[PDB]
């Protein structure tokens, strides 16, 4: 690939060199590998979480008695494990022969944690089998160990899908990069009150923006649109997961 | 126990004798055995199923595509399996020594089916592991086999709890009899729109009457009141089962 020409940055002013942690460097390398290997498409959708939010906030009592904080992330994780079982092409990887997909029969999901040293994506195993408070507990633990560098490499392996939530900082949407060999990643941004037409007038609903980037070699456009739609449907009523 | 004195019923008019099926006779014997063995108390409660009902009716599409009918019974079964795990004294039986309880670590639940020949209580095994459409399917099958006498005795054993639903016929409440050796039975009657005080005015809510009869040797009053309360809470918001 052509290299970027070097520039004497100091011709233009004072410069200072700060170095990259080995974590940054690793991260850099892996992102570039994915970028060049995966033809990326991002599919955007908005989900109506007005009722999810109300539920979340009402279980604050129960969550506190169990020692967890109930955030949107366990809810996101549960709904995506369910969908990853329904739409198995999203829970698979392109086999090295380029002619086969390896469908995984297990659902382990990573979530992005931004730490001082760089990005870590701890993995929760068998998300499909854990309850909302189990997942809330575990997510937090893995997050604290990640910030504290106490996260052992084991816990960073064998994920099937990644959720990257920036909803806590802000933004309308973004286009995340697929962590190959996985085939998709869900970016989640800040929720806003939006007017949503009820057939007769505009009702304020709390809308969560979802950005699903996918490996277009493995997932086609219609499959991805169907995935964010189902997910919008599941978050609008999490009871459908009970069915 | 003193016998009832025989009466020449024909002194008062024309009488006709019809006989009892062996099923009726079996049933009669077992009910009398429970009645004399179990000091019975019934605890009454009403649950707000307005939102459960809305969910039920909205999933009519999905249920039809799967070939099942989604009634309140799978919803009742799921919520009681969850509670039977939370409050284990209800999932147990008095040991023959009278000095021990046998806590069952499994949740199988029977439901009453009234057939021409008498009452049958088919049992669904491991209710705690099945989904609302699995349970809707299975309930129906066992019900059809029961009406058709094709229900094999195997499927009538080892239940932990019984639900008796008369909601489809009518009534406000009733006092069911415990099927010993089980320690409790949930009677469910017809749902009505009721005014429920919201703190400022009376709101119409769809209320389902619950009548829990229990073996007072094993379950005390406070435990039973706590069970129907939790159940009223779970049916008012089935998403708490996800937690």
Answer yes or no: are the C-beta atoms of B184 and B104 closer than 8 Å.
no
Residues of B in contact with A78 (CB under 8 A): 242
Burial of B20 by CB count in 10 Å (0-12 exposed, 13-18 middle, 19+ buried)? Answer: exposed
B187, B64, B79: which is closest to B127 by C-alpha?
Answer: B79
Resolution in units of Å: 2.6
Helix H or strand E encompassing A82: helix A72-86
Pairing status of strand B192-197 against strand B202-215: antiparallel
Q: Among partner residues A55, A133, A243, which is closest to B239 by beta-carbon distance?
A: A55
CA dihedral A66, A69, A71, A77 (to 10 degrees): -50
A95: which DSSP letter?
-
Instruction: Find the catalytic residue in B32, B40, B168, B216.
Output: B216
Start-to-end C-alpha separation, chain A: 50
Question: d(Cα B145, Cα A14) in Å, to the nearest integer?
Answer: 86
Method: X-ray
Cα B115 from chain centroid (whole Å): 16
Residue of A nearest to B62 (CA): A243
- Per-residue H/E/C for chain B: CCCCCCCCHHHCCCCCCCCCCHHHHHHHHHHHHHHHHCCEEEEEEEEECHHHHHHHHHCHHHHHHHCCCCCHHHHHHHHHHHHHHHCHHHHEEECCCCCCEEECCCCCEEECEEECCEEECCEECCHHHCCHHHHHHHHHHHHHHHHCCCCCHHHHCCCCEEEEECCCCCCCCCCCCCCCCCCEEEEECCCEEEEEECCCCEEEEEEEEEEEEEECCCCCHHHHHHHHHHHHHHHHCHHHHHC
A241 with B241: Cβ contact below 8 A: no
Quick check: B55 and A237 CB within 8 A? yes
Q: Nearest to residue B238, comparing CAs of B82, B8, B129, B98? A: B82
CA distance B32 to chain A (A): 39
The DSSP 8-state label assigned to residue A96 in this structure reads T
- Check if the beta carbon of residue B176 is closer than 8 Å to that of residue B169: no
Q: Which domains does chain B have, with CATH numbers?
A: 1-243 (3.30.559.10)
How far apart CA B77 and CA A134 sit, in angstroms, is 23
Name the residue facing A239 among B133, B238, B243 (closest C-beta). Answer: B238
Rounded CA gap, A78 and B239, in Å? 12
8 Å CB contact of B242 and A242 = yes
Write phi, then psi, for A3 (nearest 5 degrees).
Answer: -80, 160
Q: Kindly tell me the burial class for residue B208, based on how many C-beta atoms sit within 10 Å of its own C-beta (0-12, 13-18, 19 or more).
A: buried
Give the number of C-alpha atoms closer than 13 A to the C-alpha of residue B96, restricted to the C-beta side: 0
Cα–Cα distance between B39 and B135 in angstroms, integer? 32
How many other CB atoms are there within 10 angstroms of residue B14's CB atom?
6
Report CB contact under 8 Å: A131, B243: yes
The answer to whether the Cβ–Cβ distance between A241 and B243 falls below 8 Å is no
**Number of neighbours of residue A190 by Cβ within 10 angstroms:** 16
Taking an 8 Å cut-off on Cβ atoms, the answer to whether B243 and A55 are in contact is no
Please calculate the CA angle B188-B190-B196 and round it to the nearest 5 degrees. 100
* Catalytic residue list contains A32: no
Q: What angle do CA A51, A54, A58 make, to 5 degrees?
A: 140
Angstrom distances, CA of residue A208 to CA of A47, A212, B242: 5, 13, 21
The answer to whether the beta carbons of residues A110 and A125 sit under 8 Å apart is no
Q: Chain A: nearest CA to B154, how far in angstroms? A: 27
> How far, in Å, are A79, A135, A155, A240, B122 from residue A139 at the CA level?
15, 6, 12, 23, 41
In the structure encoding, which two tokens stand for residue A235, read together? Answer: 């978050």
Q: Which residues of A touch B237 (CB under 8 A)?
A: 55, 58
> What is the b/e burial string over A12-33, where b = at least 16 CB atoms within 10 angstroms of the residue's CB?
eeeeeeeeeeeeeeebeeeeee
How far, in whole angstroms, is CA A99 from its chain's centroid? Answer: 27
């Amino acid at each position: 690939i052509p290299p970027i020409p070097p520039v004497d940055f100091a011709k233009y002013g004072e410069i200072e060199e700060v170095p990259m942690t080995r974590l940054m460097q690793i991260g850099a390398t892996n992102l570039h590998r994915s970028w060049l290997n995966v033809p990326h498409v991002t599919q955007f959708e908005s989900a109506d979480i007005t009722e999810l939010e109300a539920f979340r906030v009402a279980q604050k009592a129960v969550a506190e008695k169990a020692g967890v904080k109930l955030t949107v992330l366990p809810l996101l994780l549960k709904a995506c494990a369910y969908l990853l079982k329904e739409l198995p092409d999203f829970n698979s990887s392109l086999a090295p022969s380029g002619q086969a997909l390896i469908r995984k029969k297990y659902v382990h999901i990573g979530f992005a944690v931004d730490t001082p040293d760089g990005l870590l994506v701890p993995v929760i195993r068998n998300v499909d089998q854990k309850s909302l408070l189990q997942l809330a507990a575990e997510a937090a633990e893995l997050a604290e160990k990640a910030r504290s560098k106490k996260l052992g490499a084991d816990a960073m392996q064998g994920a099937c899908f990644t959720i990257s939530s920036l909803g806590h900082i802000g933004g309308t949407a973004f286009t995340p990069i697929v962590n190959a060999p996985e085939v998709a990643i869900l970016g989640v941004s800040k929720a806003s009150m939006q007017p949503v037409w009820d057939g007769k007038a505009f009702q304020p609903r709390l809308m969560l923006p979802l950005s699903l980037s996918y490996d277009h070699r493995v997932i086609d456009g219609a499959a991805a649109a169907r995935f964010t739609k189902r997910l919008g449907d599941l978050l609008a009523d999490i009871r459908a997961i009970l069915l």
